C-alpha cells in the first residue's frame, strides 16, 4: 500500500489509474481482514448430499 500510494503522485494519469486499481484491491484485503492466499484452495468444501440428491 505504501508503494502504491507513492506511485499515486505520478504525473501520468495512466500510472495513477493503474495504481488506484491495485490499491483498491489491496485496501479491500486490509479492511476486511481476509488473507490473499485464501484465494487458493487447499481444502474443497463438499455440498450436503440432500442438495445434490
Amino acid at each position: 500500500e505504501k508503494e502504491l500510494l507513492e506511485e499515486m503522485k505520478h504525473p501520468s494519469r495512466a500510472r495513477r489509474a493503474k495504481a488506484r486499481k491495485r490499491l483498491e484491491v489491496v485496501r479491500a484485503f486490509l479492511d476486511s481482514g481476509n488473507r490473499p492466499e485464501w484465494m487458493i484452495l487447499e481444502a474443497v468444501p463438499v455440498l450436503p448430499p440432500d442438495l445434490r440428491p
Binding site: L41, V44, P45, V46, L47, P48, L51
Partner: protein, 47 residues
C-alpha cells in the same frame, strides 16, 4: 384447529443458498444488531 396462522420463519431456499455459497468457499454469515453471528440452522450444522 380454528386458530390464526403463526409467524413465518427463514425460508428453506435461503438455507440452500447459504450452503451453496459455502460450497464455493465463501463465508456467508447472518449477524444480529450487535454483529454477533446468528445461527439459522437450529444448531444442526454447528460441530
Amino acid at each position: 384447529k380454528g386458530e390464526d396462522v403463526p409467524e413465518p420463519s427463514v425460508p428453506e431456499s435461503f438455507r440452500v443458498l447459504v450452503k451453496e455459497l459455502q460450497a464455493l468457499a465463501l463465508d456467508v454469515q447472518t449477524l444480529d444488531e450487535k454483529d454477533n453471528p446468528v445461527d439459522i440452522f437450529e444448531g444442526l450444522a454447528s460441530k
